[PDB]
Amino acid sequence: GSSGSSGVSDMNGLGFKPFDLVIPFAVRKGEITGEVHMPSGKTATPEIVDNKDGTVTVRYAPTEVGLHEMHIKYMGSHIPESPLQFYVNYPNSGS
């Protein structure tokens, strides 16, 4: 008795809430790259998606808890938005 589509699996699916971000300045997909520093001691790359307007949206869904530091560089140059830090709170937190 509830709209149930085929998505989430047994192994895994929707862990921690996602993190969408949009660069303030205008960039052109190409000589740009991004990196993510996990608190556990690992690393991962963000998600560079070119919006249907002409901008980009850096999205990175956290897999573990703790503090993660993102590092994005545009054409071999650090941006005024990075580096940055985002704490991963537990799921279904808060009363």
Tell me about this structure:
- The protein has 95 residues and is mainly beta.
- It has one domain (1-95): Sandwich (Immunoglobulin-like), CATH 2.60.40.10.
- It has strands at 20-22, 32-37, 43-44, 47-50, 56-59, 66-74, 84-88.
- Strand 2 and strand 3 (43-44) form a beta hairpin.
- Filamin repeats lie at residues 8-85.
- This is Filamin-B.
- Belongs to the filamin family.
- The modification N6-acetyllysine is found at residue 52.
| CATH topology group | Immunoglobulin-like
Distance between the termini: 26 Å
Output the strand order for the largest sheet: 3-2-6-7
The CATH architecture classification is Sandwich
The count of DSSP E runs of length 2 or more, i.e. the number of strands, is 7
**Percent helix among the residues?**
under 10%
The largest sheet is: 4 strands, antiparallel
Task: Count every helix, treating DSSP H or I runs of 4 or more residues as helices.
Answer: 0
| CA-based shape | globular
The CATH homologous superfamily is termed Immunoglobulins
Structural class: mainly beta
Radius of gyration, rounded?
16 Å
PDB class: structural protein
Keywords: beta-sandwich, immunoglobulin-like fold, filamin, Structural Genomics, nppsfa, National Project on Protein Structural and Functional Analyses, RIKEN Structural Genomics/Proteomics Initiative, rsgi, structural protein
Assembly: monomeric
Entry title: Solution structure of the 16th filamin domain from human Filamin-B
